Design a binder for this molecule. Sequence first.
Ligand code: NI
Length: 341
Amino acid sequence: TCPFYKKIPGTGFTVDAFQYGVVEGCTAYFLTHFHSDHYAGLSKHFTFPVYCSEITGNLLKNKLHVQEQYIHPLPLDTECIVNGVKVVLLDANHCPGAVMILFYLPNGTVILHTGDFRADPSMERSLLADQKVHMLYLDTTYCSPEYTFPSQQEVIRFAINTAFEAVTLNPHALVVCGTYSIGKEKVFLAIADVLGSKVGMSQEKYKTLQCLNIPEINSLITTDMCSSLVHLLPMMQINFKGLQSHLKKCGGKYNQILAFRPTGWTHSNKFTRIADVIPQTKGNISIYGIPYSEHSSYLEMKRFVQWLKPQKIIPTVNVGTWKSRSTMEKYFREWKLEAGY
Ligand code: NI
């Protein structure tokens, strides 16, 4: 059964609610983005209208085989009427195709559902500038002040400089980058661009990337692993055993691996600067964990909410424990008392 924080009151709509069977009263199912915890339940046998971005709808059709007649892609930044209700899709600054959804309820209430997002000051000049928001369904993944991490631009500068130094010192080094979902494509694309290579990957991952509307993508990726010196592997293989095994398969072309594991936050963030990050090394294999986040830091989240000034907040992450719920409610009240709304 579908939980309350996935239902939009005063509508027939649900958000990210495909794992509960037929939800009573739902006339349109929205999908914020193509991550498995959110799409869980969708397949070629789905027969209700799904509303989403163009990119999400390319993934639903090619990867999950949902039939075309049930996929309703909406353009971004554009007022659309769905089943008698005005909606807008906004870029969420999460993975490719990820959106926030503005709902203009028939009674005058305005609701923002963030989906998953990484808050940014540029959202203060989107279509959100133009009217009041009563209710905020908020991605609270990192809603605690210990969650600090650098900008995505600082993390990519670190990765590119690290990879270019290593391969210039040793032209026989291979670079490997872990992946298990869409998102974080800048890591492997930025490193392949500085090295003058395409990114090599499996047929299944090439297929996924071909759905993402990235400009000039045919110039950037390949399934011919032998022609490439940046390889993508599943995240589970980014360990010393997995990497040793991969290096064997390369037929003596390479004699060293430098590997990247983009994580979210880890507790090594509480003490060390991005500048000072060091790898784990065994022999001719070195592994860097890099804190590339596609979710808001605590500070980015707090700035967004203090600007928006919602009347009510409904968290969508960390909702399962009383301690997490009480912690998040305390910070929301701090924010509100500090800013005066
Ligand atoms: Ni996500």
